[PDB]
């Protein structure tokens, strides 16, 4: 029932509002979401209802120093959109794009703002014969948030 | 005096605190700065005192679909660090790097009244024989009516 497509500039306000309505995700500035629409649309996705509401969003980008790794920043799915495995559908949709043809690995972090994320990434990994590992994100000089590595594809 | 270097992962908290103390820059989450430090260090810079205090930061990255364009996201210069022309020094430092040796254009956005910020980018262009252009970009439509000034697109180049 959702149409998945890359985001466009006119989606930025709505994506910022969706993220706000999906606590505990960190709410970045509206301008940051607009930059995702402007510069990263080919590696991001929105899920748009029949009536035009944006009920899902994924922000992601290839790592500049490791271009076979897709790094997933935030996954937002509105309560009204639960029970469609939308987070997994959105990640799969990104990975099937031409810009992602050489992606071997996925990385994201899981901590206070996105524990519900783990099921989404394990689902993706499961659908693609890949496996989820985890490692502490921070080193011992800093200041549990974990880097998840999902692979291979 | 300050020295300039790429940020390291553990600079995230200090860079986040620096932006919080430079209103009216838009503050993003801590994690957004951690990700700049972790994924974009080769195109960002901090200005650091001999004592290790960060009073300047620039975030920038090459555009994934237009890799000869460097986009500058935020230029933070603490009030205690005025009069050092840190913004221009920091931008120059990034542009000088081996990672930016193929950059032909620099893009950034500026609000309506931000004249000093325009002069920084103008000065940079002049020292490279580059053109500066400014076009409407993010307006009320793009912000969904939120209480935020318009951001025009400032574009310098070709270098």
From Swiss-Prot, chain A:
GO terms for molecular function: diaminobutyrate acetyltransferase activity. Pfam families: Acetyltransf_1. It is an enzyme of class 2 (transferase). The keyword Lipoprotein does not apply. Keywords: Acyltransferase, Transferase. Gene3D superfamilies: 3.40.630.30. Pathway: Amine and polyamine biosynthesis; ectoine biosynthesis; L-ectoine from L-aspartate 4-semialdehyde: step 2/3. The keyword Transferase applies. InterPro entries: Acyl_CoA_acyltransferase (IPR016181), Bact_Acetyltransf (IPR050832), Ectoine_EctA (IPR012772), GNAT_dom (IPR000182). Residues 2-151 form the N-acetyltransferase domain. Its EC number is 2.3.1.178. One of its GO terms (biological process) is ectoine biosynthetic process. Belongs to the acetyltransferase family. EctA subfamily. PANTHER family: AMINOALKYLPHOSPHONATE N-ACETYLTRANSFERASE-RELATED-RELATED. This is L-2,4-diaminobutyric acid acetyltransferase.
